[PDB]
Amino acid sequence: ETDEEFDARWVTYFNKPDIDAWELRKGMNTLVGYDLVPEPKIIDAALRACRRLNDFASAVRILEVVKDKAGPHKEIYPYVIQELRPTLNELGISTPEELGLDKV
Amino acid sequence: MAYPFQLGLQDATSPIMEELMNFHDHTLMIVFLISSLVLYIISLMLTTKLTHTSTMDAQEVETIWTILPAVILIMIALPSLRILYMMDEINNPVLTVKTMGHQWYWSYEYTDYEDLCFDSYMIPTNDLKPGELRLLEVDNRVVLPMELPIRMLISSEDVLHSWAVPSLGLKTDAIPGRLNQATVTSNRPGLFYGQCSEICGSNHSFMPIVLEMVPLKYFENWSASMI
Amino acid sequence: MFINRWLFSTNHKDIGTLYLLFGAWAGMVGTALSILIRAELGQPGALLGDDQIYNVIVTAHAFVMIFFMVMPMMIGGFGNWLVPLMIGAPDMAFPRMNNMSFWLLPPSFLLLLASSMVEAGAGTGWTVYPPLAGNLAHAGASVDLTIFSLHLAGVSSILGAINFITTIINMKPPAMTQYQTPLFVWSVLITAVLLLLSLPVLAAGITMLLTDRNLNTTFFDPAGGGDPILYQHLFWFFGHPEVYILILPGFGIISHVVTYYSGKKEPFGYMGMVWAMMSIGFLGFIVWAHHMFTVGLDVDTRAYFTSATMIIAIPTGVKVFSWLATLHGGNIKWSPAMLWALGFIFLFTVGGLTGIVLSNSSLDIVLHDTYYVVAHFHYVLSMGAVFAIMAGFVHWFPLFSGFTLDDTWAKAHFAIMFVGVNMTFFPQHFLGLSGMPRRYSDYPDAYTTWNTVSSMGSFISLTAVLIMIFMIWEAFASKREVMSVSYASTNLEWLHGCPPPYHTFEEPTYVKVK
Amino acid sequence: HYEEGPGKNLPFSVENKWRLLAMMTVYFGSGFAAPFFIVRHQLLKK
Amino acid sequence: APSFHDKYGNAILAGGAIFCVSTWTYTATQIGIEWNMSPVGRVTPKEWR
Amino acid sequence: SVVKSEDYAFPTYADRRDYPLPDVAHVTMLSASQKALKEKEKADWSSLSRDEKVQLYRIQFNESFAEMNRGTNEWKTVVGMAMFFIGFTALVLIWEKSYVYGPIPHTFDRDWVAMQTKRMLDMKANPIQGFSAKWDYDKNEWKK
Amino acid sequence: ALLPKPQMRGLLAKRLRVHIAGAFIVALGVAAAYKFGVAEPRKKAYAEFYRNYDSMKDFEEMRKAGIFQSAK
Amino acid sequence: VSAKPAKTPTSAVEQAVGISAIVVGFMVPAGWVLAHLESYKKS
Amino acid sequence: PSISNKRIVGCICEEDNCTVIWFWLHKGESQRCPNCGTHYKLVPHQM
Ligand code: HEA
Ligand code: HEA
Ligand code: CUA
Ligand SMILES: [Cu+2]
Ligand SMILES: [Mg+2]
Ligand code: NA
Ligand SMILES: [Zn+2]
């Protein structure tokens, strides 16, 4: 199928104001199963949905599921974080490389 | 006639079983190709880093998945039937030899003309001539000629034996009440060995078959001077 | 109380636990028998003197670990432990008949041991080819006890198959159709169908053989109009369906293991898997004369049977391709059950492909009753169904008992078992290609070296089975219970807890209305 | 009512580890050592 | 936390590897069994009547 | 202390990258400092520092995804005790060769091997590729 | 400076495409390795053996020693 | 399957004597039979 | 309906599906099938 209506219904699903952590939880659990590193607009929608009911931890888990889905090549997440950066300095969220979650 | 660290087949004398070797090498190509393919897939896709656990499509790969093993099996089976329908051609039996599998030994009958039969026992280990073999020596050998299509008519008394020589590619089960016809052709003289390939009791490991094949002038000088 | 639980049992879980115990006992019995058989082929000698007792040992090995390890453990234990738990049924439809089948198994074991006990001995191979099994070459009471052991095992298997078919078809939730059950339930469906459509020919043939031995009939005596090839036809008409009995719940267990630890919610191509397994269960009955390409059949018959053998070869390839495509991009976790499953896939694949090499009648003319055949089926049975049953037991042992095995010890067991069974069964390819016949206590010198190598490999496998008892002792030396189970939603059997109580499904499952 | 739980759905005693080790080793050793006794009895008989 | 593996993996590679290679060259060479080696190349054949 | 018998029935914590956001929190009971932490979660985020972020992540869920999938070293111990037990099997071979087996057959003697090899080369045993294809019949020595 | 957009849809599909091409070429390489190693060397051994071959001289070469039971 | 830790611990020494007891109990009747067959052959 | 406060609920939540999603349902508020979105409420008043 095509990707535009796919991304449109996903950003429609996340941006609704009546979301809860269980609904976005199951949405992210069924979104992570695709053979696809998700585009940054999806990650904006997921981050705003996670912000709307006060969770740091799930947002950092969103950032590190963008991390481990990159595989051996690590040119994905610098582009991802340079597309995510305005949400990063308006939200106060932390990348997993900076609060000490990348390290063992 | 085996030798230590032998991995392949027993080397050829009959044209039927050297064509069996050609087909054996072709199916060894096939099993090497598909075993290396599944080995590469197993060592490949267990060594990935990415995940995909969606409800993927199903009915989009079955046409190749159905036709390609059929194509491989039909190129397997075409030489199979090609050589299978070549061991049963119009016989020209220069010689007919009967054998009948006695209780842990054999008997051989050459009675096309001037009736001749003998019973082949086993040489024991403590009675061995120096330089001979263990579990593969017989006092009364089976003498055949070369370059000739010869028939073996096999039978037995009570138990199911099996007349088998792998170097000539012959193996047929000796059954009571049923004589079986097996053709044989040899291109070299010599002594070619085989053993029982059906269980027959408390000495089943102790009957060998030995085929000494010689030219025909020694057949007049041998069968004329045996009885 | 003890007698009313473990002797008068009427629930499937306790009866299945008793199949685990009896199958483990028979597995160690046949393991010891294999230790003897490889024990004097390490060095060429008459360590047991005459090879009549060697044929007794080989026949005992074959019978105890075909009908007393793999069938009880696999069919009875895993069916009675899993089939009510996957489909949601509280019990089986006929529990007393299932208990009669289980309790019929140890008299069959006792009569097989007594058949080995009598001084003539039932040394006639796994196939019971007359009149070597007749009243002149085996004049004694031993092979009659072997026949009655086969009667008891066949009747127990038939009763179990009846109960399995009626509890899959009838004891199912109403709005669930036949194509929503897990694939192990389909495996035992076609398996129990093939038991019930194969074992009457075996029972008739061995009743015929008993009547030939004792009541002076001549079904298999050609002096009175009989033919031994009638027994060969009847026996292998039973036998290759019995072969696919021995392999098909292994396919079901392997499919569940592969789709479980890979993180797949659904195995790839479920309808394709179901079609392939019904295709195997439909084509298993028209292939049996591949065991008789050296008996003297007509050439058109042999051509038809090798063609049908390739037609039964294709759906197995469909199954192995669907396994490699249900591994597709999964979150693989290296539990030892995946190690057993990968060993299953590779070694069952190479054993089956050497079977395809043996399938063509022209090559099977020269490669009949040699160790190439032994290598083919010892691969397929002796480590395909074996690694399937250790994958199932290691996977479901928290469900069966409550405690867990050590992962390091189980992976070490996989390593020692892998090295042992590969060293045991690799060089006998070259032994069979060189022309070494089966059922031989002693061999010529040129077949020595590979024999010696394979024999010490068997000892390696012996060390493997020791670790088995040790690690299961380690479970009862640790009493370490479970936190929880992953992927619990897609499997009903894990969802009543580890271990499930005596009475599960007091109130049965609720189905989607649609 | 019947007793259900971890180790209570087994016929053998679970609570003592050393007698469990002794009973499992004699049970599996009897299973292992049965064909050796059979083959030595047919060696003694013939 | 230091687990069993973090140094005992190297410890059991060292011990088990040297023990296995020592006892297998002992059982391959030092006993005196007959392997029925191939008579190609190096051994000589002697004439028999 | 003892949890109720329906522990399997309750939704349980699980840590894997297939299921990265489990339905229940890792630490279900919250302490009073963690209650103040949760109301500080209810407030704004940009006025909150790194150490209570990392302790917040450690008390909400169990561990991070970067270090749960690290390379544990159990394969080393597995292969080590493996070859240890192949070594114990070799000791079993020592005992079972010393005590169980009798003498080898007399055909394994070197002179008998020499005469039977001469017999094999004399009657041209499989002389195309198998055994007698490495023996020159002119120089009467193996092929080099 | 600025990083461009990388590949982001279905890279495992491209990985399996280039790797099933690699699987096909290594299967053909294994088959051709067995071919060139064994098969036509075996047929070449048969061809070199049989064209310079006669049964009478070979028979005499075996029967100088007296292996045969039909010639003394 | 995630596992709770051991309610009864198991140190190295009881594991060692357990595997030693298992191997000697498995090998002493088998090695008793295979250690001598000249007596069983009535030779 | 129920007789206890806990029951098996299977969801064949989209038509012609392989797998039935099995989960325990408890007394109280209705929570859905964990992948599709079909609600399920238990009423323990059936003896
Ligand atoms: C579970 C046990 C099992 C299984 C699965 C099989 C499977 C097969 N068996 Fe076998 N067989 C036995 C157990 C088994 N067998 C036993 C026990 C005996 C001897 C009994 C005795 O001692 O008397 C025996 C004997 C036996 C013989 C007799 C040899 C002789 O005695 O002379 C033959 C020959 O036709 C044969 C053939 C086959 C074939 C063709 C298959 C096939 O089903 C194998 C297919 C498996 C595969 C894994 C296919 C691989 C395909 C792919 C990987 C996909 C790619 C393919 C293409 C591109 C074409 N079997
Ligand atoms: C179930 C089928 C099966 C299995 C597994 C095996 C397994 C083995 N077989 Fe068997 N074998 C046959 C069926 C089987 N065999 C048949 C049918 C014949 C032909 C009979 C005839 O001649 O007619 C035969 C013949 C046969 C011969 C022929 C003798 C000869 O030709 O002279 C030989 C010797 O090499 C042999 C060896 C072995 C070995 C070394 C193993 C090893 O794999 C043994 C190791 C296996 C295990 C250790 C199993 C694991 C068990 C446990 C872990 C305990 C159980 C407990 C739990 C599972 C919890 N087999
Ligand atoms: Cu004649 Cu076996
Ligand atoms: Cu068959
Ligand atoms: Mg046969
Ligand atoms: Na022996
Ligand atoms: Zn649903």
For every residue of chain G, which 3-state class applies, written as one string? Answer: CCCCCCCCECHHHHHHHHHHHHHHHHHHHHHHHHHHHHHHHHHHHHHHHHCCCCHHHHHHHHHCCCCCCCCC
Among candidate residues C419, C442, C446, C417, the one with its CA nearest the CA of residue C431: C446
Calpha distance B225→B221 (Å, rounded): 6
- Distance between CA E15 and CA C356 in Å, rounded? 43
**CA pair distance C276, C10, nearest whole angstrom:** 35
Technique used by the depositors: cryo-EM
Query: How is residue F129 written in tokens?
Result: 């590729």
Tokens of D5: 């739980």
What are the beta bridge partners of residue B165? B170
Please report the DSSP string for C77-101 in residue order: IIHHHHHHHHH--SS-S-HHHHHHH
Q: H12 exposed, middle or buried (CB, 10 Å; 0-12, 13-18, 19+)? A: exposed
3-state helix, strand, coil in chain D (%, to 5): 65, 0, 35
- Name the nearest CA neighbour of C36 among C19, C16, C55, C8: C55
Residue whose pair of structure tokens reads 């299932």 in the numeric block: C98
Nearest chain G alpha carbon to B186: G55
Residue B31 and residue B104 in one domain:
no
Dihedrals phi, psi of C252, to nearest 5 degrees = -65, -45
Give the total residue count for chain A: 104
Nearest to B23, CA basis, from B93, B89, B75, B88: B75
Query: Interhelix angle for A40-51 vs A57-68, to 10°?
Result: 160
Question: In chain A, which residues have their Cβ closer than 8 Å to the Cβ of F54?
Answer: 99-101
- Cβ(B136)–Cβ(F116) below 8 Å: no
Resolution of the determined structure in angstroms stands at 3.3
Distance B211 CA to ligand 6 centre (A): 27
Of residues H20, B196, C367, C291, the one with CA closest to residue D21: H20
Q: What is the 3-state secondary structure (H, E, C) of chain B?
A: CCCCCCCCCCCCCCHHHHHHHHHHHHHHHHHHHHHHHHHHHHHHHCCCCCCCCCCCCCCCCHHHHHHHHHHHHHHHHHHHHHHHCCCCCCCCCCEEEEEEEECCEEEEEECCCCCEEEEECCCCHHHCCCCCCCCCCCCCCEEECCCCCEEEEEEECCCCEEEEECCCCEEEEEECCECEEEEECCCCCEEEEEECCCCCCCCCCCCEEEEEECCCHHHHHHHCCCC
Closest CA to C211 of C202, C220, C198: C220
* CA pair distance B133, B119, nearest whole angstrom: 20
Using a CB-CB distance cutoff of 8 angstroms, which residues of chain G are in contact with residue B219? 70
Amino acid at C134: G
Residues 6 or more apart whose CB falls under 8 angstroms from that of B95 comprise B110, B112, B144, B145, B148, B150, B151
Quick one: CA dihedral F59, F65, F71, F74, positive or negative? positive
Q: For residue C376, say whether it is annotated as part of any ligand binding site.
A: yes
Q: Chains A and F: how many Cβ contacts under 8 Å?
A: 79
Residue linked to tokens 């005693």? D13
Spatial distance between the Cα atoms of E18 and E13, rounded to a whole number of angstroms: 8
User: Quick one: tokens of G35?
Assistant: 């071919």
**Residue extents of the structural domains in chain F:** 1-144
Nearest-angstrom CA–CA distance, F72 and F63: 15
Nearest CA to ligand 2 atom 45: C31
Maximum alpha-carbon separation in chain D: 55
State how far the Cα of A27 lies from the Cα of A22, in Å rounded to an integer. Answer: 8
- Provide the CB-side half-sphere exposure for F95 (13 A, CA): 14
Terminal-to-terminal C-alpha distance of chain H:
58
Q: Chain I contacts of C510, Cβ < 8 Å? A: 7-10, 25, 40
- Please give the backbone phi and psi of residue E17, each rounded to the nearest 5 degrees, phi first: -65, -50
Where does residue F5 fall: left (phi above 0), alpha (psi -120 to 50 degrees), or beta otherwise? alpha
Q: Is H31 left (phi over 0), alpha (psi -120 to 50) or beta?
A: alpha
Ligand 2 pocket, residue C202 CB under 6 Å:
no
d(CA C48, CA C40): 8
**CA of E42, closest CA in chain B: separation in Å?**
15
> Where is the binding site for Zn(2+), in residues of I?
11, 13, 33, 36
Nearest one of C40, C62, C181, C64 to C114, comparing CA atoms: C64
CA of C327 to the centre of ligand 4 (A): 30
Chain I contacts in chain F segment 13-52 (CB below 8 A): 23
d(CA G65, CA A57): 91
Amino acid letter, residue B46: L
| Cis bond before residue C131 (omega within 30° of 0) | yes
Q: How far is CA F128 from the centre of its chain?
A: 45
CA neighbours closer than 13 Å in the CB half-sphere of residue F138: 1
- Determine the distance separating the centroid of ligand 2 and the alpha carbon of C355, expressed in angstroms: 18
Query: E strand or H helix at H19, and its extent?
Result: helix H12-34
Q: Which listed ligand is nearest to B199 at the C-alpha?
A: 3
Q: How far apart are CA A75 and CA I19, in angstroms?
A: 38
Q: Which residue has the tokens 């036949």?
A: C178
Which of C233, C358, C363 to mutate to test ligand 1, by most ligand atoms within 8 A of the CB atom?
C358
CA contacts within 13 A on the Cβ side of F81: 19
Q: Is the bond preceding C107 in cis, omega lying within 30 degrees of 0?
A: no
Please say whether the beta carbons of C9 and C18 come within 8 A.
Answer: yes
User: How many angstroms separate the CA atoms of I6 and C128, rounded?
Assistant: 55
Cα four-point dihedral sign B113, B114, B119, B124: negative
Secondary structure letter of residue F19 according to DSSP: S
Chain-centroid distance, C-alpha E30: 10
Q: How far apart are CA C96 and CA C8, in angstroms?
A: 9
How far is Cα C397 from Cα C410, in angstroms, rounded to an integer? 12
AA identity, residue E13: L
Start-to-end C-alpha separation, chain E: 77
Helix-, strand-, coil-residue percentages of chain E, each rounded to 5 = 55, 0, 45
Whether the Cβ atoms of residue C223 and residue B155 lie closer than 8 Å to each other: no
- Measured between alpha carbons, how far is C472 from D21 in angstroms, rounded to an integer? 10
Quick check: CB of C62 below 6 Å from ligand 2? yes
d(CA C108, CA C97): 16
Q: What residue has token string 């028209």?
A: C286
Residue ranges of domains in chain C, CATH in brackets: 1-477 (1.20.210.10)
The torsion angles phi and psi of F3, rounded to 5 degrees, stand at: -70, 150
Centroid of ligand 2 to alpha carbon of C382 (angstroms):
6
Pick left, alpha or beta for residue I37 (phi over 0 → left; psi -120 to 50 → alpha; otherwise beta): left
Q: Do chains H and C touch (3 or more CB pairs under 8 A)?
A: yes
E-state strands within F1-140: 135-136
The partner residues of I7 in beta bridges, in order of sequence, read I25
Structure tokens at B23: 């087909």
Residue C154: which of C71, C268, C42 has the closest Cα?
A: C71
Which residue's entry shows tokens 């290296």?
C334
Structure tokens at C134: 């007749």
Question: How many of the other CB atoms lie within 10 Å of CB of B115?
Answer: 9
For strands B95-102 and B150-156, give the pairing.
parallel
- For residue I21, the cross-strand partners are I11
C138 vs chain D: nearest CA distance in angstroms?
A: 16
B9: Cβ contacts below 8 Å, ≥ 6 apart: B20, B21, B24, B166, C366, C433
All partners of chain F with 3 or more CB pairs under 8 angstroms: A, B, C, E, G, H, I
Tally of structural domains, chain E: 1
DSSP class per residue in C283-299: HTTS-GGGGGTTS---H
Bridge partners (DSSP) of residue B150 are B95, B184
Q: How far apart are CA B47 and CA A62, in angstroms?
A: 25
Q: How far apart are CA E31 and CA F91, in angstroms?
A: 12
* C-alpha closest to that of A83 among D12, G64, G2, B103: G2
Q: Which sign, positive or negative, has the C-alpha torsion D8, D12, D14, D15?
A: positive
Told to judge if C429 belongs to the known catalytic residues of this protein, a careful annotator would answer no
Q: Are C493 and C86 contacting, i.e. CB atoms less than 8 angstroms apart?
A: yes
Give B157 to chain C, closest Cα distance, Å: 10
Q: What is the DSSP string of C229-258?
A: HHHHHHHHHHHHHHHHHHHHHHHHHHHHHH
Residue C437: DSSP 8-state: B
Q: Whose CA is nearest to atom 56 of ligand 1?
A: B69
C-alpha span between C189 and C37 (Å, rounded)? 36
Rounded to 5 degrees, what are φ and ψ at I7?
-150, 150
Gaps in chain B with C–N over 2.5 Å, residue before each: none
Closest residue on chain E to F79 (Cα): E13
Neighbours of G48 (CB within 10 A): 11
The CATH number of the domain holding residue B78 is 1.10.287.90
Residues 6+ apart with CB under 8 A from A85: none
Beta bridge partners of B194: B209
- Using a CB-CB distance cutoff of 8 angstroms, which residues of chain F are in contact with residue A60? 57, 64
CA angle (B124, B128, B133) in 5-degree steps: 90
Q: What is the C-alpha separation between C34 and C113, in angstroms, rounded? A: 16
Kindly tell me the burial class for residue C49, based on how many C-beta atoms sit within 10 Å of its own C-beta (0-12, 13-18, 19 or more): middle
Domain residues of chain H, as ranges? 1-43
In order, the DSSP letters of C134-159 are STTTS-SSHHHHHHHHHHHHHHHHHH
- Nearest residue of H to residue C476 by CA position? H8
**Residue C117 to residue C37: CA distance in whole angstroms:** 18
Residue pair B184/B94 in contact (Cβ under 8 Å)? The answer is no
In sequence order, which residues have a C-beta less than 8 Å from that of residue I16 and are 6 or more positions away? none
C273: amino acid identity, one letter: M
- Is residue G23 a contact partner of residue B41, using CB atoms and an 8 Å limit? yes
Angle of CA points A16, A22, A23, to nearest 5°: 35
Tokens describing residue C451: 């024999």
Q: E strands within C251-375?
A: none
In chain A, which residues have their Cβ closer than 8 Å to the Cβ of F50?
94, 98-100
- Please count the helices (runs of H) and the strands (runs of E) in chain D: 1, 0
**Catalytic, out of C12, C138, C290, C302:** C290
Helix (H/G/I), strand (E/B), else coil: H3: strand
Q: Could you tell me the residue range of the domain that residue B72 belongs to?
A: 15-85
Active-site residue flag, C256: no
What backbone phi and psi angles, to 5 degrees, belong to C305? -75, -35
Element (H, E) at C114: helix C95-117
Q: Report how far Cα C490 is from the mean position of its chain's Cα atoms.
A: 27
Cα within 13 Å of Cα(C476), Cβ side: 24
Task: Tell me the backbone φ, ψ of residue B117, rounded to 5 degrees.
Answer: -145, 150
Question: Do C303 and C360 contact (CB within 8 A), yes or no?
Answer: no
Which is nearest to C33 in space by CA: C66, C54, C57, C52? C57
Distance C376 CA to ligand 1 centre (A): 7
Residue I23 carries which DSSP code? E
Name which of B133, B167, B168, B154 is nearest B198 in CA terms.
Answer: B154
Where helices occur in chain E by DSSP H, the ranges are 5-25
**Cα(C162)–Cα(H18) distance, integer angstroms:** 43
